[PDB]
Symmetry: C4
Subunit: 93 residues, 4 copies
């Protein structure tokens, strides 16, 4: 069902944005200072846009293991979207 996936992604996004605001908020305030800043940056990361050279590398220079957070977040959001976008398309057929 498509309703489960959009909700699943919404929940994952709030937990990750809390976790990111918590973990990296003090050291990276512009990208992770708020829940709302983090939601936006995690969205950018989901679009694969400058995620490594722009966000994750400058973070790993302070939090060398930040990659265990962001890579799986990516693999998770990316997968869920394809199952989601295909979900709506196929469901009407």
């Amino acid at each position: 069902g498509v309703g489960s996936v959009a909700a699943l992604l919404t929940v994952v996004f709030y937990i990750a944005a809390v976790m990111a605001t918590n973990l990296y908020g003090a050291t990276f305030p512009e990208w992770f200072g708020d829940l709302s800043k983090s939601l936006y940056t995690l969205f950018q990361v989901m679009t694969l846009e400058s995620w490594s050279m722009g966000i994750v590398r400058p973070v790993m220079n302070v939090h060398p293991n930040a990659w265990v957070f962001f890579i799986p977040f990516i693999m998770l959001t990316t997968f869920t979207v394809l199952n989601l976008f295909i979900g709506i398309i196929v469901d009407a057929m």
Copy 2:
């Protein structure tokens, strides 16, 4: 039908490019000064290319709510393209 979608995308792109030229044109002339400049930049945004670090963040530094314009535009264009490209391929089957 596939014909509905390509027209839909053209309409959405002109409304958004008018809206973007109107909203951000005076403060960001190189990216939004004309209809034609905006068409091109909104296209870039559709390709997810440097959209956050290159366009939307520098805009939000002047228009902090610019994210309510660009994120939905993205989620919309990205969705319609996948439905369109799949649409034609299946249409021949």
Copy 3:
């Protein structure tokens, strides 16, 4: 058939790389000075990687209509790949 598409793309890529070496080679030598340089840069453009902020905008500052070359090239290569990648996957099923 999948054999037609891989060849079609190969031909389009040589014509476009000749045309790009011809049109922009003198004014943008590092990206378009050779056939082989252009093949590589057009490939980057096909991957949507920094294509606008990195290549096409600096070019349009010299060739303002360069967008009539690169945007359709993009829409063409992007479409042909999806039909191609789906082609092999479905063909074995």
Copy 4:
């Protein structure tokens, strides 16, 4: 089978990361100094993120044929991922 592909991708990624640490590690330590650094950078390359303007062009300025390594790696990982993500979804049908 979907199990074959995830293992295939892991093997390809370790061979490429050994090869990249070996080939480019001494001249590009931040991106290729370790197995683990290379795993991360090769992953970034798989996401098409700043791979040309950020990694491959600065490398080709030292290793002009670095393109015979990275382009095929890309065409390979990108292909296997699409076959993998589609693989699981269809597998449940």
